[PDB]
Design a protein around this motif. Structure first.
Motif, short mmCIF file in Angstrom:
data_model
loop_
_atom_site.label_atom_id
_atom_site.label_comp_id
_atom_site.label_asym_id
_atom_site.label_seq_id
_atom_site.Cartn_x
_atom_site.Cartn_y
_atom_site.Cartn_z
N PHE A 104 -15.83 7.19 -11.95
CA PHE A 104 -16.42 6.66 -13.24
C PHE A 104 -16.30 5.28 -13.25
O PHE A 104 -15.78 4.44 -12.22
CB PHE A 104 -15.64 7.19 -14.42
CG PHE A 104 -15.94 8.91 -14.72
CD1 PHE A 104 -17.09 9.22 -15.12
CD2 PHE A 104 -14.91 9.46 -14.36
CE1 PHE A 104 -17.37 10.67 -15.06
CE2 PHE A 104 -15.06 10.89 -14.40
CZ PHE A 104 -16.26 11.48 -14.97
N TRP A 105 -16.77 4.39 -14.22
CA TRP A 105 -16.44 3.05 -14.46
C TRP A 105 -15.73 2.66 -15.58
O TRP A 105 -15.59 3.67 -16.41
CB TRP A 105 -17.77 2.14 -14.46
CG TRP A 105 -18.88 2.15 -13.35
CD1 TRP A 105 -19.54 3.42 -12.83
CD2 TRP A 105 -18.80 1.30 -12.50
NE1 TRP A 105 -20.05 3.19 -11.59
CE2 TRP A 105 -19.65 1.87 -11.27
CE3 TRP A 105 -18.46 0.02 -12.35
CZ2 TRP A 105 -20.36 1.09 -10.31
CZ3 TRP A 105 -18.99 -0.85 -11.18
CH2 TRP A 105 -19.84 -0.04 -10.09
N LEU A 106 -14.83 1.88 -15.45
CA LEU A 106 -14.06 1.28 -16.62
C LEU A 106 -14.77 -0.04 -17.13
O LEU A 106 -15.05 -1.11 -16.32
CB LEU A 106 -12.66 0.87 -16.12
CG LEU A 106 -11.76 0.19 -17.27
CD1 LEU A 106 -11.72 1.24 -18.77
CD2 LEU A 106 -10.39 -0.03 -16.80
N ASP A 107 -15.10 0.25 -18.57
CA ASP A 107 -15.68 -1.14 -19.35
C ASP A 107 -14.55 -1.92 -19.88
O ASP A 107 -13.93 -0.90 -20.63
CB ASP A 107 -16.99 -1.02 -20.08
CG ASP A 107 -17.27 -2.21 -20.68
OD1 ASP A 107 -18.46 -2.85 -20.27
OD2 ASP A 107 -16.84 -2.94 -21.57
N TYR A 108 -13.93 -2.97 -19.55
CA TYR A 108 -12.81 -3.45 -20.32
C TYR A 108 -13.05 -5.07 -20.74
O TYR A 108 -13.27 -5.71 -19.84
CB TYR A 108 -11.80 -3.48 -19.11
CG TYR A 108 -10.29 -3.85 -19.66
CD1 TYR A 108 -9.71 -3.63 -20.86
CD2 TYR A 108 -9.60 -4.48 -18.88
CE1 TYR A 108 -8.65 -3.93 -21.28
CE2 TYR A 108 -8.10 -5.11 -19.12
CZ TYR A 108 -7.68 -4.50 -20.41
OH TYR A 108 -6.38 -4.95 -20.94
N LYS A 109 -12.70 -5.16 -22.05
CA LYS A 109 -13.01 -6.34 -22.36
C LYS A 109 -11.64 -7.05 -23.14
O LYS A 109 -11.09 -6.06 -23.91
CB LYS A 109 -13.83 -6.49 -23.66
CG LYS A 109 -14.25 -7.74 -23.82
CD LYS A 109 -15.34 -7.71 -25.10
CE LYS A 109 -16.35 -9.10 -25.35
NZ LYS A 109 -17.14 -8.75 -26.41
N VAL A 110 -11.18 -8.08 -22.86
CA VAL A 110 -10.05 -8.76 -23.35
C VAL A 110 -10.51 -10.01 -24.21
O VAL A 110 -11.10 -10.82 -23.94
CB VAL A 110 -8.87 -8.76 -22.44
CG1 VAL A 110 -7.64 -9.28 -23.25
CG2 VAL A 110 -8.53 -7.31 -21.71
N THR A 111 -10.08 -9.95 -25.69
CA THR A 111 -10.70 -11.04 -26.64
C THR A 111 -9.42 -11.39 -27.39
O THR A 111 -8.55 -10.92 -28.02
CB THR A 111 -11.60 -10.46 -27.49
OG1 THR A 111 -12.70 -9.75 -26.85
CG2 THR A 111 -12.19 -11.45 -28.54
#
Length: 179
Positions: A104-111
């Motif tokens: 699978f893929w990890l989509d990861y955003k840090v804001t």
């Protein structure tokens, strides 16, 4: 992709850094990857937005913000990845997630979240979801109360940029102990 919050799914590794805002502050760091991609007062240390273990980035200003040790590590010193108030808690579990979903893929955003002209953000938001071989979305549940799941299964966690023994001046980026 059936979510506007996520990086468009090309099926390759992606690192999008937000540009510095008008005040020269990091604005976000966004990664889409797989398990195979893996690598008196003082002034505050800069912590990573997207962890080094994911993105390999070396003091890239667009991936750094002033941050307490308590937020980055869960602890006054060392590290405590059981404290759900710290970033390590989620980073370690996402990395564990990746190892168990090699396909699978990890989509990861840090804001970072700022108010006014403060150089120190009040909060950090972690946004994460998994994506399968065909672009379908998979909710990732890290067993924390801070989690909030949206109408597409994307999880956001709001973390406080602070620490129980410290007085932060968020304007200037200084820290003094509590008296």
């Amino acid at each position: 992709t059936v979510s506007s919050k996520l990086l468009p799914f090309t099926a390759n590794y992606q690192l999008q850094l937000g540009e510095l805002d008008n005040l020269n502050r990091a604005t976000f760091s966004h990664i889409q990857l797989q398990d195979r991609h893996e690598t008196s007062s003082w002034v505050m240390n800069r912590g990573h937005l997207v962890g080094y273990q994911f993105c390999g980035l070396n003091d890239e200003p667009r991936n750094l913000v002033a941050m307490t040790a308590w937020l980055a590590t869960g602890a006054y010193s060392g590290a405590n990845d059981s404290n759900p108030e710290g970033m390590l808690y989620y980073e370690n579990r996402l990395d564990s997630w990746l190892a168990l979903h090699p396909d699978f893929w990890l989509d990861y955003k840090v804001t970072p979240i700022y108010s006014g002209n403060e150089v120190v953000p009040r909060q950090i938001e972690l946004q994460y979801v998994g994506i399968d071989s065909s672009g379908e979305l998979l909710t990732i549940r890290l067993n924390s109360n801070k989690e909030s799941i949206d109408e597409n299964g994307v999880t956001t966690v709001i973390l406080e940029n602070s620490a129980p023994n410290i007085n932060l001046d968020y304007l200037n980026g200084t820290a003094t102990p509590k008296n």
